[PDB]
Design a protein around this ligand. Structure first.
Ligand SMILES: [Mn+2]
Ligand SMILES: [Mn+2]
Ligand SMILES: [Mn+2]
Ligand SMILES: [Mn+2]
Length: 254
């Protein structure tokens, strides 16, 4: 294959925030911020399904697998990041499928998974489920991923409006999730970091109770990344969120 130049290793100031919530008992969200041998940065977030058994086992499994595989890696080019994320996500899905099938305590477990590979100017995002990746600056908050949910299937087919989907009685249903099938087709995205201040990854425990406007205005205000994370978690709890709330906040600079 053709001669290509090595981009430098790049990372963003990113922090991981997770909370079980008062209303639930255990945290079935997992995730983390991991680095490979050349110090490339991978952000990982998983939402284990609460309606099924052992959501924390599934999310923890996918997270630990991605951490091990990525930390074992040396270099991933930008034009190969899509293949890397898709392949490893597929294999982890297969392993999680047989993991749930063979263990009777874990029968039917599953988890969402959104993850981002950070490069000098782009971010490569892979998504399976209704966890989200946003990009935010002073003027716009754009959701990069598309929810693999039923209500978003109705939205994308003109059957309901997004505002209707936010209060739809079946807004919890997931249509693509890890561990339920032998195969999975993850959604893959490339996003330019030119004109944005924040990359956000979050489970639905946040955005099921905090709309994009509130996130945008909270983030575009002044304050450090720790202050923004604290205020964002507290805003999720103030809007009476009753799921696990987890998000990675990544500050971007030119
Ligand atoms: Mn969950
Ligand atoms: Mn459970
Ligand atoms: Mn949901
Ligand atoms: Mn959730």
């Amino acid at each position: 294959i053709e001669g290509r130049h090595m981009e430098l290793g790049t990372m963003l100031e990113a922090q991981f925030f997770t909370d079980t919530g008062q209303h639930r008992d255990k945290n079935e969200d997992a995730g983390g911020i991991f680095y490979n041998q050349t110090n490339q940065q991978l952000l990982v977030l998983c939402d284990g399904m609460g309606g099924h058994k052992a959501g924390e086992v599934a999310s923890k499994f996918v997270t630990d697998e991605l951490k091990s595989r990525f930390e074992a890696e040396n270099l991933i080019e930008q034009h190969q990041a899509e293949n890397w994320l898709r392949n490893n996500i597929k294999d982890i899905n297969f392993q999680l499928y047989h993991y749930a099938q063979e263990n009777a305590e874990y029968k039917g477990m599953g988890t969402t998974c959104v993850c981002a590979l950070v490069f000098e100017k782009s971010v490569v995002i892979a998504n399976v489920g209704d966890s989200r990746a946003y990009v935010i600056n002073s003027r716009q908050i754009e959701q990069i991923t598309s929810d693999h949910s039923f209500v978003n299937h109705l939205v994308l087919t003109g059957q309901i409006t997004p505002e209707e989907a936010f209060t739809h009685p079946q807004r919890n249903i997931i249509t693509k999730v890890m561990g339920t099938d032998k195969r999975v087709s993850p959604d893959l995205f490339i996003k330019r970091l030119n004109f944005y201040d924040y990359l956000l990854l979050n489970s639905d425990g946040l955005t099921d109770y905090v709309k994009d406007n509130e996130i945008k205005r909270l983030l575009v205000k002044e304050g450090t990344i720790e202050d923004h994370g604290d205020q964002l978690m507290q805003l999720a709890l103030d809007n009476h969120s009753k799921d696990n709330v987890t998000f990675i906040l990544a500050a971007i600079e030119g």
